[PDB]
Amino acid sequence: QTDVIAQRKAILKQMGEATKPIAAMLKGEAKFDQAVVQKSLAAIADDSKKLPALFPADSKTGGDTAALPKIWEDKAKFDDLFAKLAAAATAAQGTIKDEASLKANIGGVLGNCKSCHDDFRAKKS
Ligand code: HEM
């Protein structure tokens, strides 16, 4: 075993950082950059494939984790959500060509973050 919780929180933090450039663009605070968008989408898709291996049943009582017990009661659903994110991100990479398509396609990707957090992450801090 190892400190899997530190592992996952780090990768998940990277996903949040990855969405920043995109949110800046939506908020009109940054000029649309296709290279930056694709870089963030690729990062998100790659991390989504690494995360399914980082949620072992013995990592629910750390004291510094926001992962809810339900993850282990609905593990098939939880894993698939990461799969849905990866698939959505990879698809987005191919459909997002300009600012108009970013605004139009980014929701399907980012909607996954909320879907999981609603059921599997503790509201707090
Ligand atoms: C999707 C684009 C997405 C983002 C963005 C995202 C971010 C995120 C952050 C920033 C955290 C906190 C990490 C930290 O402590 O620094 C976090 C935490 C959890 N998430 Fe999330 N998340 C995104 C997607 C998903 C998906 C698709 C799921 C589940 C299928 C998911 C789950 C979780 C869980 C659970 C945590 C808590 C981790 C822990 O404390 O052990 N996220 N997310």
Swiss-Prot record:
Gene3D superfamilies assigned: Cytochrome c/b562 (1.20.120.10)
A GO term for molecular function: heme binding
Domain of life from the UniProt record: Bacteria
PROSITE patterns (alphabetical): CYTCII
Record-level GO BP terms: electron transport chain
Binding site for heme c: 8, 65-66, 113, 116-117
Keywords: Electron transport, Heme, Iron, Metal-binding, Signal, Transport
A cellular component term, taken from the record's GO annotations: periplasmic space
Post-translational modification comment from the UniProt entry: Binds 1 heme c group covalently per subunit.
Pfam families reported for this sequence: Cytochrom_C_2
Function according to Swiss-Prot or TrEMBL: Cytochrome c' is the most widely occurring bacterial c-type cytochrome. Cytochromes c' are high-spin proteins and the heme has no sixth ligand. Their exact function is not known.
Quaternary structure annotation from Swiss-Prot or TrEMBL: Monomer.
Name this protein carries in UniProt: Cytochrome c'
Gene designation per UniProt: cycA
